[PDB]
Amino acid sequence: ISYEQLSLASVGSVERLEGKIVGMNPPQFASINEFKYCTLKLYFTQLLPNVPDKVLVPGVNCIEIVIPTRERICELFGVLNCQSDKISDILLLEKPDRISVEVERILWDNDKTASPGMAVWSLKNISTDT
Amino acid sequence: ISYEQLSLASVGSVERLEGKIVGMNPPQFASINEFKYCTLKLYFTQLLPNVPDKVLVPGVNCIEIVIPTRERICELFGVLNCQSDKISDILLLEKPDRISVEVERILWDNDKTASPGMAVWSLKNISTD
Secondary structure, three states: OHHHHHOOOOOOOEEEEEEEEEEEEOOOOOOHHHHOOOOEEEEEEOOOOOOOOOOEOEOOOEEEEEEOOHHHHHHHHOHHHOOHHHHHHHHOOOOOOOEEEEEEEEEEOOOOOOOOOEEEEEEEEEEOOO | OOHHHHHOOOOOOEEEEEEEEEEEEOOOOOOHHHHOOOOEEEEEEOOOOOOOOOOEOEOOOEEEEEEOOHHHHHHHHOHHHOOHHHHHHHHOOOOOOOEEEEEEEEEEOOOOOOOOOEEEEEEEEEEOO
């Protein structure tokens, strides 16, 4: 299936996905300061995004998309909107509106001597249309 | 037990595995309070005898193990020890010594705040032995 095969994608890969953002991690937060150490992750799927009952499983069911820095979070969402209620409305989690994203497979090498580095999907582009 | 089979495990599954905690997320932190919204995750794998070594891809290359609550973090590690440097020492991430973990597939939900639950591996037991 697509998410299992996407999870095998090598660093450098760029994919266009269409569907819905069905969740974020962490699901609650109050300011940009929450993301000094913690990372904002989005969950994306075009497979039964609606069904209540849905148990998300990143890499089989949906993909995890990291927004890697506070600066990138701000660029996309604005520092003034960086509370989970507001990001939720912006990402249309409670609405049927479809989303299109370009994601990029990056080597995400965290802090100093690493964590170590891991391969993750990061948000290249996002359209709240169409 | 392949990683693929581990990614498909039904909620409630328990597994005893041996290998190494090779990293933690977040990889740097100062106190327990950083885990109010953020979740501590550990990365488990079996290590390479005489080879590299490196790019973790959770679910394919290793498993991510979540310690779902602050209460659980303290119970295992101690509120006094909840700094990334101290936990790294406790988890022996810089010694070659093998670790033994028991993980449980849990439905992790999750404030229940227009969120969905996620199936994840939770730390049931760990031995440094």
